[PDB]
């Protein structure tokens, strides 16, 4: 939201990442890798505020000056943001083109010339290759920042120019404590939120304050009828909310916990639904369970990658295939190639 939100565990990293700029040895580029809602956005914002501030205070930005006063108004003439338009999802060549053509001119306020790409994975590869020159060899006093959920999906070249700084999710107990201070409910839900979100406290907050949690509950209840009866089709309404990737991820997490329960493991992710875990283990055969988990992950990938795919057809075929697999006498697929 307004200037986003600082996150308490982020303070160490920023300090390190500002030292390299205090000494003047700062690499112009930077590819911050951080989970969604982790808090990398606040880090990039605070960095840019320090960089473009005419008087950089020790570890702070200014205290008082116009140089970042224009930053707070979000109207600095050097500070550029590259985010896809609210009505679109792919960052076009045109915006990066405008930013890079306007970079060759001098710094308006006599300071740095800071750029920022809001999310690098959204960059079209044509835009990435238009931005390659600007990243590799920028003009003097030009800096960059980028944010990625993962770096491996980026273009082979763009990350090669940049430093791959990493944001480690906070320790499990600290994250649980912070979320408990923020949101109040049973710790099983909080552990499920953190482990589901791969440790991103911001993503756990989004899960709680977002409706999905209740919808998640819905799914659990639906499975509570499906697995004892072998009637999975009735899950359709639960798995279609334009959140098919996230809901399929929750389903795959449940199946992971069941397969863990087979090879009895001390820790599993879903701790709010142990009875569901036990039931899933009881009814389903391990080979069938792994084939079903593979199909769930495959469908989630197919939905996440290709936009414009029909969600209803995919999920319906998935549920029919699962129902087929629960019938004895079927040959299950195995990952290969």
């Amino acid at each position: 939201g307004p200037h986003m939100r600082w996150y308490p565990w982020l303070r160490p990293d920023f300090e390190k990442l500002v030292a390299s700029y205090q000494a003047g040895r700062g690499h112009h580029a930077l590819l911050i890798q951080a989970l969604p809602g982790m808090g990398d956005d606040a880090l990039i914002y605070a960095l840019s505020r320090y960089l473009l501030c005419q008087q950089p205070q020790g570890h702070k930005s200014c205290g008082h000056c116009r140089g970042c006063q224009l930053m707070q108004a979000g109207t600095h003439p050097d500070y550029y943001t590259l985010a896809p338009e609210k009505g679109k999802n792919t960052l076009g060549v045109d915006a990066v083109r405008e930013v890079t053509e306007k970079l060759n001119e001098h710094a308006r306020l006599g300071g740095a010339k800071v750029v920022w790409v809001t999310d690098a994975a959204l960059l079209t590869d044509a835009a990435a290759n238009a931005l390659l020159k600007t990243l590799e060899e920028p003009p003097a006093e030009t800096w960059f920042f980028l944010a990625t959920r993962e770096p491996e999906r980026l273009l082979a070249t763009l990350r090669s120019r940049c430093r791959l700084h990493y944001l480690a999710p906070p320790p499990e107990q600290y994250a649980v404590t912070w979320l408990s201070r923020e949101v109040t409910m049973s710790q099983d839900a909080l552990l499920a939120a953190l482990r589901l979100s791969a440790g991103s406290p911001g993503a756990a907050l989004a899960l709680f304050q977002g409706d999905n949690w209740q919808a998640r509950e819905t799914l659990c209840q639906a499975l509570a009828y499906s697995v004892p009866s072998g009637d999975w089709y009735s899950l359709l309404a639960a798995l279609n909310h334009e959140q098919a990737p996230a809901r399929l991820h929750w389903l795959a997490t449940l199946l992971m916990d069941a397969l863990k329960r087979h090879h009895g493991a001390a820790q599993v992710t879903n701790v709010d639904v142990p009875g569901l875990v036990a039931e899933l283990a009881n009814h389903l055969s391990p080979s069938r369970l792994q084939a079903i988990l593979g199909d769930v992950c495959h469908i989630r990938e197919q939905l996440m990658s290709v936009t414009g795919i029909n969600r209803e057809l995919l999920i319906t075929d998935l549920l029919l295939r699962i129902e087929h697999y629960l019938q004895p006498g079927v040959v299950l697929p195995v990952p290969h190639l």
Partner: protein, 248 residues
């Protein structure tokens, strides 16, 4: 906001600035790939202000004394800045207080304030561009050349208006062909003291140079059928022009 201190300060007559800009404006790049070309170089040294403009096929240098001791400085002002600078200054008022800083330029003209940001970078030197051993020379009245080239440019190609110069002792000749397989040819009586030479120019830049030269007599310097031409006032050395020729 606190104003930026200036490292280059001077004051100019409106006539001098207008002459410089008219002399070099048609000679600067538009959206060209080389970022440091889309602008005008304002060199200053001694008591002389010099102005350089290039697009890879053209070069206008205009030097005018100022009488004010000035440091050796360089600066590039982009397309829009200089266009609206020329638009801004038109009257006869003496105040032209020009301030050049590290990143921006401001010219005060009475009640109007000029503002733009400089194209960061270093301009190529013009002296390396002007041929150093011109061993062929030509002379003619400025208006005769300008009218001749305007007349011959009528039936040239549309997008790139190439013309061919045949320069010899007997006379000067210029010809033009177009995609419509139309021929135009004409003769001028320039004084030459050499042998035959064939060169290929673009009539657009030549016509622009002649139009903005604004003198009486003009002298051309030449070295080779591929090297650069150096057109100048036959009565002064305050402005020089270069037109890299055309392949045929």
């Amino acid at each position: 906001l606190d104003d930026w201190q200036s490292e280059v300060e001077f004051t100019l007559p409106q006539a001098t600035m207008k002459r410089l800009i008219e002399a070099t404006q048609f000679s600067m790049a538009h959206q060209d790939v080389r970022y440091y070309l889309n602008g005008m170089l304002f060199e200053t040294e001694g008591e002389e202000l010099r102005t350089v403009a290039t697009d890879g096929h053209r070069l206008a240098v205009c030097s005018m004394p100022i009488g004010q001791s000035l440091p050796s400085h360089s600066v590039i002002v982009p397309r829009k800045g200089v266009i609206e600078l020329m638009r801004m200054l038109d009257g006869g008022d003496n105040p032209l207080r020009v301030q050049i800083g590290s990143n921006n330029i401001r010219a005060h003209v009475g009640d109007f304030i000029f503002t733009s940001k400089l194209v960061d970078g270093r301009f190529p030197d013009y002296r390396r561009v002007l041929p150093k051993n011109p061993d062929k020379h030509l002379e003619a009245g400025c208006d005769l050349l300008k009218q001749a080239f305007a007349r011959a440019a009528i039936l040239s190609n549309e997008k790139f208006r190439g013309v061919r110069l045949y320069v010899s002792e007997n006379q000067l000749k210029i010809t033009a062909n177009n995609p419509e397989q139309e021929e135009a040819e004409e003769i001028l009586d320039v004084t030459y003291s050499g042998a035959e030479m064939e060169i290929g120019f673009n009539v657009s830049y030549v016509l622009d140079v002649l139009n903005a030269l604004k003198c009486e007599n003009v002298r051309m310097m030449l070295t080779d059928s591929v090297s650069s031409v150096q057109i100048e006032d036959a009565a002064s050395q305050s402005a020089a022009y270069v037109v890299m020729p055309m392949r045929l």
